[PDB]
Amino acid sequence: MTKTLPKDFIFGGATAAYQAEGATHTDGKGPVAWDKYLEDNYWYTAEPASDFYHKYPVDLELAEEYGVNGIRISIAWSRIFPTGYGEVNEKGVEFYHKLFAECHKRHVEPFVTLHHFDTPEALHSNGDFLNRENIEHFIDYAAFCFEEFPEVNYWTTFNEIGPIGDGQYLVGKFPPGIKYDLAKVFQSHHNMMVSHARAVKLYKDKGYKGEIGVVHALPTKYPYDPENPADVRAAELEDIIHNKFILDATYLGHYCDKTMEGVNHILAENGGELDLRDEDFQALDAAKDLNDFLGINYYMSDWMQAFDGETEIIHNGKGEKGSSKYQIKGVGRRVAPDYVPRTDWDWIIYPEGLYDQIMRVKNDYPNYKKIYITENGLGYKDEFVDNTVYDDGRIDYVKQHLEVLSDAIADGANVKGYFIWSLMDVFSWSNGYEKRYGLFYVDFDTQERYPKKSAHWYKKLAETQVIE
Secondary structure (H helix, E strand, C coil): CCCECCCCCEEEEECCHHHHCCCCCHHHCCCECHHHHCCCCCCCCCCCCCCHHHHHHHHHHHHHHCCCCEEEEECCHHHHCCCCCCCCCHHHHHHHHHHHHHHHHHCCEEEEEEECCCCEHHHHHCCCCCCHHHHHHHHHHHHHHHHHCCCCCEEEEEECHHHHHHHHHHECCCCCCCECCHHHHHHHHHHHHHHHHHHHHHHHHCCCCCECEEEEECCCEEECCCCCHHHHHHHHHHHHHHHHHHHHHHHCCCCCHHHHHHHHHHHHHHCCCCCCCHHHHHHHHHCCCCCCEEEEECCCCEEEECCCCCCEEECCCCCCCCCCEEEECCCEEECCCCCCCECCCCCECCCHHHHHHHHHHHHHCHHHCCEEEEECCCCECCCEECCEECCHHHHHHHHHHHHHHHHHHHCCCCEEEEEEECCECCCCCCCHHHCECCCEEEECCCCEEEECHHHHHHHHHHCCCECC
């Protein structure tokens, strides 16, 4: 009677290597830019995260125990290749084989992503993906993992290529920590996207019979006053930075005129030069109908109010309602409507924005084949009571999102799965171990797992495909 999900739907949980894993120095792991930024530029350190390095056994058991038939995991690049390129760290490759064995032992299909914010320190410093030399090292790493790991049927290149730009060269969040460098944001996108296109082409050529794809963060951008041509334009140009430039490269194998018209405008008003090449478009063009699936990482929508003035961005990493500021010259300013609910980090809780993006991708690019919601959830300071957590809050947010998932499907969108973030509690980039997102509460002091109320909820959802 209520919204109901496909029988064959995958009800998974997602995780990330450098957040869950642990053992940063333990067993051959090479360094990453995070190891320092968290220390000097922050307070808390990734050690011991959620001890996934040794605890995967309990987690996959619990996942299977509560109806989780899919799990997002990422191969820590620095683990396989300590420096980024060269001699393989036999110990690293081992762990990953053992991790997957448990996956199949447990009946939780692994969806593996290669790069998830962990570019090996050395390569990161040497330009990351703004240095074409590094594009090859990635191409090698991908090539390698493809050959080494036959257990994995689902592969993914990059997780959140847009945010990687947003955080490193625009909102200065992640290391390096640059600000307002839109030429870099666009450049980063082109280079990182080319890297993926070359991975996807190689996978197909080599013959592997699995499924390669991408995981894009797609926060819907709406004009503050739809009747306002300026604001409508504000959202046009805001969407072009975080979403359209990337999605184009992915499915058209080039950037259409609107995207260019706008990218040229941004860089006019903000200054910048871009290095785009025929070979990049030859590579991008060759892989536009090879992606097997599309990974949509949706959390919220933004409202843009076209407004002149100098550019300024204030990131709310501490969680202070309204401390967030964002304005870009030649674009507009984000302005959150008061009718719509917010969390302490100023993330809007707007489900329809999801459905809207699903339809946006579906109509703009038919060739998408299928969709997977590879990320979505709500993180706050959960309270441990009765050695559980009465997170009725989370259930409500996630439920609403799943409700419109039914709608998008019913209305033609080919969405085949959901991955709540995270499976169990993990370390947070901007918030440390305070922003709990998982279905299972991890007592970080004892690395214990206690299933929260959302787990038992999720189960009956997973085994009845009835949202209620």
